[PDB]
Nucleic acid binder design. Structure first.
Ligand code: CL
Ligand code: CL
Ligand code: CL
Ligand code: CL
Ligand code: MN
Ligand code: MN
Ligand code: MN
Ligand code: MN
Ligand code: MN
Ligand code: MN
Ligand code: MN
Ligand code: MN
Lengths: 96, 78, 93, 107, 105, 92, 85, 98
DNA sequence: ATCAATATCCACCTGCAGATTCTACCAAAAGTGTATTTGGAAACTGCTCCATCAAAAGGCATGTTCAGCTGAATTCAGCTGAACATGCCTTTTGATGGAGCAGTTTCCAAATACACTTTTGGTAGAATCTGCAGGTGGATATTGAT
DNA sequence: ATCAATATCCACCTGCAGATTCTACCAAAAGTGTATTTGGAAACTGCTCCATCAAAAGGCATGTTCAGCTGAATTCAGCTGAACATGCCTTTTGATGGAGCAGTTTCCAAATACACTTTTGGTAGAATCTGCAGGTGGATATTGAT
C-alpha cells in the first residue's frame, strides 16, 4: 500500500492552502462563538450576516499572520515545529 | 465547550496557509486562547458602536470601525 | 507671546492627591503632553462617532462612547462615573 | 448678574470653558453640546489624578518631594491599564523598568 | 454644460470630493484646487492597482479582477505593500511562500 | 441611495484594461481602498492646516500630506499627477 | 561663518554607547557584528523621522526645525513622544 | 594574582546600573552632528531648535532600548545569551519594520 | 542514480446557472450666475534664539592582552506528531413563517449659536522659597581566590 | 569554609539652580438677549434576522503504525568580556553677530453665500456571457527495490 513520508502531505497542504482564498473555519461553530462572546458584553444582540462574515475574515487573517510569525520564531531556534513558546514570543514582540 | 468548535483540522489549515509544516500538540489550545482574546477585543468595540447608535443589531460597519480602531483595517465590507 | 497650558490645573490636582508633593518642570511638560494627547484621542473618536451616525453635534454621549472605546475596562468605568457625575452636577447647580 | 465658572458648577479643577473653546475650534463637529466639555474635562482631570497619585507614591518610595519623569514612567509601566493606555508613548527621561531575564542570572 | 472633472482631465468626481472635504469636519474652508489634487491622486493610485491586478487576472486566464488578483498585485509591489501594510483584503489569501529550510533536501 | 466610487473605478479600469472586468467583491475592496486613502490624506491635511493656524485646506496641504503618506517614488508620481490636474483645471 | 562639512558622523554612535543602550535593554552579551548593524538601523530610523520633520518645516516655510515638527513626525510614525510640547 | 571579576558579573552590574538611571547614553555633540548631517542631506542650511535635537535623541534611545529588549528575547528563544544581528532582524521583521 | 509503480496536480473541455454588464427613469447632487465677504500673504520691524567658536578639565573612547565561557558542531534514541482507514455526527443546504428591528416623516420644545458687554481667571515676569545634587564617611552584601 | 577585594547602599550636610509664590494687567470666559438648528416622540412600513424543521454530505473524531525530529549529552576553538594605559574630544559656560521667527497693518484673490437650472449617479430588471462543477489526459513529483 502507498504511504507518503511525514512532511510530504504537509508541504502539499501548505501549497494548496496558500494558493486558495476560502475561509478555513466552519461557519456555524464560529457564528455560535461570536454570539456567545457578544452576549458577555451586551445581551439580546442580533447580528448582520456581513458582520459575522467580516469578523471571520479578520480572525482568519490575524491567525494566518500570527502563524507566519510563529513559524519564523520556530525556525529561528533551528527547528521546524511551532510550539506555544513560538506563539508567545511572536505575540510579545508584536505588542500583544 | 463552544470555543472547541474551532477544531484541530481548522487550526491546522490556518497554520498551513501561514506556512507551517509541523505542529506541536499543544498549539491548538494555545491558538484557541489567542483567538478568544482577539475576538473579545474586537466584539467589545463593535458592540460599543452598536450601543452608541441605539441599535440592537451588530452591523458590518460596527465591525469595520472596531477593526480600524485596533489597527487592523479590513477591506471589502463598507 | 501668551502661551496657554494645563499646568495650573494639573498642580491643583497634584495638591489634591498629594498635598506635600511637588513636580519638576520636565514632569509638568510630560503631563501637559499627556493631557493634550488624551484630549485629541477622545475628541477625534467622538467626532468620528457623530459623523458615523450623521449627527452634527458632539454631545456628552459621544464623549462617553469615546471614553469606553479608548480606555481599558476598569479605568473606563471609573472615568465614566466621574464624567457622568460632573455632568449631572453641572446641569442641576 | 453674578459670575460662576462652569468648572465650579461641575465641581471640577480642569477648565470647562477652555475645553469647550478647544472643542469648538478644533474642527470636530458643526456643533458642541453643553455637557460634552464638562464630561471631557472631568475625564481628563480624573486620568491626571490617577497618574499623579501613582507617580507621587513612586516619588515617596524614593524619599523625594518632587515628581520627576522617572516617577511617571514607574507609575505608568507598573500599572496594567495605564501601561496599556500609553503602550505607544515615550516618556522623555523616564528610563525603563528594572528587569533581568532569569536565564541571565548567574547559575 | 461642463463638469470640473472634465476640466481637470480626470475620471474621479471633483465635485463629490469637494463636498466630502467640506462635510468631513476637516477645515472651516476648502480651496478650489484641493479637490482636484486629491481626486487626481486617488485616480492615479486606483489606476496603478487596477493595472497590476488586471495583469494578474490575465495571468490567471480570467476576464474579471477578483480580490485574489488585488492581493497579488498589492503584496508583490513593494510600495503598495508598504502603503497597505496593515490592511486586510477579504478573500485575498496570502502569497505563496515556503521557508527554504522546510523544503526537502 | 447608497454612494460609492464604483463608476469612476470602472472608468479607470476601462482606461487601463479595456477588456477586463471586475467582480462585486473586488469592487467593494476598491471602494474600501479609495475611502481609506481619502481619509488618510484629508486627515493629514487637516492636521497640517491646524498646526499652522490655517482655516483653509488648499492643494498645498494635499501635496504635503501626500508626501508624508506615500512611499517615495509613488509620492513623486502622485504629486506630479495632482499638480498636472490642478494646472489643467486652472487653465480650463 | 560656516561649519566644516559634516561627514561620517554615524561613527559617533560608538561601541560603548551601543553597549550602554543594550545594557539598559537587558542585554548581557553582545556579538561583535551587532554594533555596525545597530548603526544601520539607527540611521534608517533617524532618516525617516527627520524626513517627516523637515517636511513639516518646509510646509511652514520655516528654516528652523522645531521640537513640534519632531513631535508631529514621531506621532505620525506611531511613536508619540511626551515632554517636548 | 590581581583581582579579576568573571565574565558576566560586570555586565550584569552594568545592566542594573543603567536600568536604574535615565540619563542619555549617546554623547550629545556626536548625536547632534549626525542629526544635522542627515537633515543636510534632506534640505540645506537648516537650523535646529535646541529641544528638537533632544527630542530626536530621546526618541532614538528609547527605540533602540526597546529593540534591544526584543533582540534579547529573540536570542534567549534560541537557547543562547548573546545577541546577534539575526536576532535584531527577527525582532524588526516581527515588529513590522522588516 | 535508474526504473517501475503510484498518487497528485494542471490544463483542457462542455453545459449552463449565476454574476456581471447594460438600460432607462428620476430624486438629488453638482453646476451656474451673481453678489458679497474675508483669510492670509505681502511688507515692515523688533527682538529671541541659533550658529559657531573658545578655553580647560576630565570623563570617556580606543587599542591591547588574555583567558573563561559561550556558540557551534555532532551524535543518538525516545517518543511526538504525521499519515491513513474507518464510521458517524455536525455542518451545510434548503424552505417557511413571523416578530422585530431599522428607517422614515413631521413639528414643536429644547438646545445650541452668536453678537455685545462685563468681569475675572490665567499668564508673564519678579520675587521668594527650597529639595536635592553632589560631597564625605561608615556599614553592609557580594564576589572570587584559596 | 574563610578572607581579601570590591561594590553597593545609607545616613548625613549645605548652597543654589530650579520650583513655587506673588502681582497686576488683560484676553478670554461668563452673562444677556436673540436667532437658528435639532432631537425625539408619535405613527407607520417593509426588510432582515431569527426560529424551526428536515435531509444528507463531507468533514471530523478516533485508533494504529511508524518515521524522523527534538532534546539531551558532549566536546572544543575562538570570541567577547574584564582590566588597564593613553590621550583626545566631549562637556560646560560664555561671547558674538546675525538669521529668522513672531507681531502688526493693509487689501486683494479667493472663498463663501444664495437662487435656480442642468446633469448625474443609484437603482432594479433585462440582457449578456464568464466562471465553475465535474470529467479527462498529460505533466510532475514521490516512493520503494536495486
Ligand atoms: Cl512550548
Ligand atoms: Cl451634551
Ligand atoms: Cl486650493
Ligand atoms: Cl547573525
Ligand atoms: Mn550631505
Ligand atoms: Mn481679515
Ligand atoms: Mn553552550
Ligand atoms: Mn483675580
Ligand atoms: Mn546624592
Ligand atoms: Mn532679517
Ligand atoms: Mn447617467
Ligand atoms: Mn474542477
Amino acid at each position: 500500500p502507498h504511504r507518503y513520508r511525514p512532511g510530504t502531505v504537509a508541504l502539499r497542504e501548505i501549497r494548496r492552502y496558500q494558493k486558495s482564498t476560502e475561509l478555513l473555519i466552519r461557519k456555524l461553530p464560529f457564528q455560535r462563538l461570536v454570539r456567545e462572546i457578544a452576549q458577555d458584553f451586551k445581551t439580546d444582540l442580533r447580528f448582520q450576516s456581513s458582520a459575522v462574515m467580516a469578523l471571520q475574515e479578520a480572525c482568519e487573517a490575524y491567525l494566518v499572520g500570527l502563524f507566519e510569525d510563529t513559524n519564523l520564531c520556530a525556525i529561528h531556534a533551528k527547528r521546524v515545529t511551532i510550539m506555544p513558546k513560538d506563539i508567545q514570543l511572536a505575540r510579545r514582540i508584536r505588542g500583544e | 465547550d463552544n470555543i472547541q468548535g474551532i477544531t484541530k483540522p481548522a487550526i491546522r489549515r490556518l497554520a498551513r496557509r501561514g506556512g507551517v509544516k509541523r505542529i506541536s500538540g499543544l498549539i491548538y489550545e494555545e491558538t484557541r486562547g489567542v483567538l478568544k482574546v482577539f475576538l473579545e477585543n474586537v466584539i467589545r468595540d463593535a458592540v460599543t458602536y452598536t450601543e452608541h447608535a441605539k441599535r440592537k443589531t451588530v452591523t458590518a460597519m460596527d465591525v469595520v470601525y472596531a477593526l480600524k480602531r485596533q489597527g487592523r483595517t479590513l477591506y471589502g465590507f463598507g | 507671546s501668551r502661551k496657554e497650558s494645563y499646568s495650573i490645573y494639573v498642580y491643583k490636582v497634584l495638591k489634591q492627591v498629594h498635598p506635600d508633593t511637588g513636580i519638576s518642570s520636565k514632569a509638568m511638560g510630560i503631563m501637559n503632553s499627556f493631557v493634550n494627547d488624551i484630549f485629541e484621542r477622545i475628541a477625534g473618536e467622538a467626532s468620528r462617532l457623530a459623523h458615523y451616525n450623521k449627527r452634527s453635534t458632539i454631545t456628552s454621549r459621544e464623549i462617553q462612547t469615546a471614553v469606553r472605546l479608548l480606555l481599558p475596562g476598569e479605568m473606563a468605568k471609573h472615568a465614566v462615573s466621574e464624567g457622568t457625575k460632573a455632568v449631572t452636577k453641572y446641569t442641576s447647580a | 448678574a453674578k459670575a460662576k465658572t462652569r468648572s465650579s458648577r461641575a465641581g471640577l479643577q480642569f477648565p470647562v470653558g477652555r475645553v469647550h473653546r478647544l472643542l469648538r475650534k478644533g474642527n470636530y463637529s458643526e456643533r458642541v453640546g453643553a455637557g460634552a466639555p464638562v464630561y471631557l474635562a472631568a475625564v481628563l482631570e480624573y486620568l491626571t489624578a490617577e497618574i499623579l497619585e501613582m507617580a507621587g507614591n513612586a516619588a515617596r518610595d524614593n524619599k523625594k518631594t518632587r515628581i520627576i519623569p522617572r516617577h511617571l514612567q514607574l507609575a505608568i509601566r507598573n500599572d496594567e491599564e495605564l501601561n496599556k493606555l500609553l503602550g505607544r508613548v515615550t516618556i522623555a527621561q523616564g528610563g525603563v523598568l528594572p528587569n533581568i531575564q532569569a536565564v541571565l542570572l548567574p547559575k
